[PDB]
Structures are given as structure tokens and as C-alpha cells.
Design a protein around this ligand. Structure first.
Ligand SMILES: *[C@@H]1O[C@H](CO)[C@@H](O[C@@H]2O[C@H](CO)[C@@H](O)[C@H](O)[C@H]2NC(C)=O)[C@H](O)[C@H]1NC(C)=O
Ligand SMILES: *[C@@H]1O[C@H](CO)[C@@H](O)[C@H](O)[C@H]1NC(C)=O
Ligand SMILES: *[C@@H]1O[C@H](CO)[C@@H](O)[C@H](O)[C@H]1NC(C)=O
Ligand SMILES: [K+]
Length: 326
């Protein structure tokens, strides 16, 4: 615990990170928690267990403030999706998560001693922005591009910086073409999915290559844009900005699953298999620790634990997956 040089982990993102906040919106009339209150934490997330942020905070002996909301995009002004269950859009980072955090930091009951040195701020967003019903189906605000998505991520860091945060980690986009949702059926991919219930009406090869181009392009722009902003444009004076190349880590797990997963070392299918309505559902035999993917879109709790251990290495300034900018 004392081997990790922070006391508080603040996370922004989507269902890869969420530890109960969409559940709050669902159960409280589609409204965020009141300022100075957090949602109830769950230990059963979209991973089938803990999210990476929970593994990381537990191993660091850190308090987790997890503002991630399942379904989120970076900015609803760029692209949004309607969640009928809450009678509004899925919450987004700029529109919903950041305003919550900005209100909460004024409460000592939540943030007893938040300093530039003792708090790490992480953002992991893009899975929904780049995917079906968003940029992949050209559903964004007309004229917006994936370059505007990258600009939004840096705007998240501006808002954190403005509150006095200085230690930033951007987690880049995963290889979404390897998620069974976007993979070809011949390689374990879904047919019609709860996340894309018309997938089989499309050239699945073309859409999977398009999401590879979008994700790799965003990853190039996140790393070199962060370098420009941090090192040339003076955008975050005296901040430390890490980029965690979780894209390479996902490829490493996918390509060598016997090094990372328990039997059956499955990377191309998914543990929890639902019909295209999202119901009914069957779990595969054997351990969840033997699956890269809890479902066709979400990394397993086992994959999430691997993300967490590498994240802590990135925060320590000693990781093959970390690039640090002062
Ligand atoms: C991921 O979550 C699964 C499911 O909860 C965990 O696996 C089980 O762990 C318990 C405690 O060891 C066992 O008794 C069960 O037999 C397992 N399966 C079920 C259905 O409960 C797994 O340990 C978690 N992995 C990580 C890395 O946290
Ligand atoms: C959405 O609106 C319906 C009907 O107006 C209502 O019954 C329901 O409680 C709303 N959902 C949320 C989470 O507010
Ligand atoms: C589907 O997309 C792939 C990848 O671009 C292409 O090679 C193939 O010709 C396409 N098939 C059809 C029927 O359009
Ligand atoms: K610590």
C-alpha cells in the first residue's frame, strides 16, 4: 500500500470503470447523487466482478472516487445515446461526471485532504464514442470527427486541472476489433448482439476494420496530442500526464492468453452470453478467470485485474505501457 504514492484515485469513464454510478441514476429518477454524496459502490460491475479502478485503489490502499457511468461518452454535444430506462441520454464525462466531481471536491466529508501530490485522476473513455450508435454509425453531431473526441479528452483534464489536480493518466482505447461485439463470427464474434442487434445486416469485416482505424488513430492522437499540450503549449503547468497504452496490453493478453488467464485461456468468445434483447443469458462452464471478455464488449474481472496492476506501474513511472510527460 505505501509502495503506491497516492491516497485517492478519481476515475472518469464508462462501464469499463463504473462501480455503481449508472445504478444510482436508474434508482433515483435518472438524477446524479446530491453534491457531497457518492453512489453506493458494488463489487459486481460490467466485468462480472471488480472494475480495474477497484483493483487499483484496493492494491494502492487508496480511496476510490469513481465518477464513471456505464454507457458514457466523453461529450453529449459531440455524440449522445438515449437510455429509455432513465428518460434521458446516457450521462457523459463533460456533461455529468465532471460537474458532479466539481461540486463534490468542496465537501471535506468526501475529500478530507485532496492535494496535487496525493490524488491521481484517470480517464478511460472511447469504447462507446467510437462504436455502434456513435461514430461507427456516423450518429455524431453532423461535421464532428474523431479528432473532436480527442480534443474532448484533453478538455476533461482542463476541468480537473482547474480544481487543482495535477497527476493525470489517460487510458487509451482498446483494440475494439478484438471485442467479440466487433469481431467476425468465424473468429468467435457475435451475430446480432444486445449492443448491436442489427450487426448481421452489415459488412461486419468493413465495420471491424473501420473501428480498428478509429481506435488506432485516436490512440496516436492521444499520445502525441498529450505531448504537445504538456510539453509545448503549457496547457497544464506543473502537471504530470501519463498515457497508459492499454491497447498494447490488450493485444499482449489476446496474443498470449496462457501468460495472463486461467484455463480455458479464451480470448475470442465471452463468458456471459445473452440474446440480442439482452435476455435470456447463459454463463460458460469453468472460471471467469479463464475468459478475456465477461461479455462481447466488456473485459472480464481477470482482464481488469491485469489492467489495474499495469496502471499502478504507469503511476509509479515504471511501465512498458506508460509514456510520462511533464
Ligand atoms: C472474478 O469473478 C469471479 C466470479 O465471482 C471470481 O470467481 C469465483 O471466485 C470465488 C472465490 O474464489 C469461487 O468460489 C467461485 O467458484 C468462482 N466463481 C463463481 C461463480 O463464484 C474470480 O475469482 C474473480 N477474479 C478476480 C481476478 O477477481
Ligand atoms: C421514466 O419515465 C417513466 C414514465 O414517465 C417513469 O415511470 C420512470 O420512473 C422514469 N424512469 C426514471 C429512472 O426516472
Ligand atoms: C466487406 O468489407 C471488406 C473490408 O472492406 C471487403 O473486403 C469486402 O469486399 C466487403 N464485402 C462487400 C460485399 O461489400
Ligand atoms: K498509498
Amino acid at each position: 500500500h505505501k509502495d503506491h504514492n497516492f491516497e485517492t484515485l478519481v476515475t472518469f469513464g464508462d462501464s469499463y470503470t463504473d462501480n455503481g454510478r449508472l445504478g444510482y441514476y436508474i434508482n433515483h429518477g435518472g438524477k446524479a447523487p446530491r453534491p457531497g454524496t457518492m453512489h453506493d459502490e458494488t463489487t459486481t460491475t460490467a466485468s462480472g466482478g471488480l472494475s480495474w479502478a477497484q483493483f487499483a485503489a484496493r492494491d494502492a490502499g487508496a480511496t476510490l472516487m469513481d465518477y464513471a457511468v456505464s454507457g458514457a461518452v466523453c461529450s453529449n454535444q459531440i455524440v449522445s445515446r438515449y437510455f429509455d430506462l432513465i428518460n434521458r441520454t446516457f450521462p457523459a464525462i463533460l456533461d455529468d461526471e465532471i460537474p458532479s466531481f466539481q461540486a463534490d471536491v468542496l465537501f471535506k466529508s468526501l475529500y478530507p485532504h485532496r492535494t496535487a501530490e496525493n490524488t491521481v485522476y484517470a480517464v478511460w473513455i472511447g469504447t462507446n464514442d467510437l462504436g455502434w450508435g456513435a461514430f461507427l454509425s456516423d450518429s455524431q453531431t453532423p461535421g464532428k470527427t474523431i479528432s473532436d473526441f480527442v480534443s474532448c479528452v484533453f478538455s476533461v483534464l482542463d476541468h480537473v486541472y482547474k480544481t487543482g489536480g495535477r497527476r493525470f493518466v489517460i487510458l487509451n482505447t482498446v483494440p475494439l476489433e478484438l471485442a467479440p461485439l466487433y469481431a467476425l463470427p468465424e473468429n468467435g464474434g457475435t451475430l446480432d448482439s444486445q449492443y448491436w442487434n442489427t450487426k448481421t445486416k452489415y459488412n461486419m469485416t468493413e465495420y471491424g476494420q473501420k473501428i480498428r482505424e478509429y481506435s488506432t488513430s485516436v490512440n496516436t492522437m492521444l499520445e502525441n496530442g498529450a505531448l504537445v499540450m504538456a510539453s509545448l503549449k503549457k496547457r497544464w503547468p506543473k502537471a504530470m500526464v501519463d498515457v497508459f497504452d492499454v491497447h498494447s496490453l490488450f493485444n499482449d493478453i489476446y496474443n498470449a492468453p496462457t501468460k495472463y488467464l486461467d484455463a480455458p485461456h479464451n480470448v475470442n468468445s465471452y463468458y456471459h452470453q445473452c440474446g440480442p434483447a439482452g435476455s435470456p443469458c447463459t454463463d460458460q462452464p469453468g472460471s471467469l478467470n479463464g475468459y478475456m471478455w465477461y461479455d462481447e464488449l466488456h473485459p472480464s474481472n481477470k482482464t481488469s485485474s491485469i489492467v489495474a496492476r499495469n496502471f499502478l506501474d504507469v503511476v509509479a513511472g515504471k511501465s512498458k505501457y506508460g509514456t510520462r510527460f511533464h
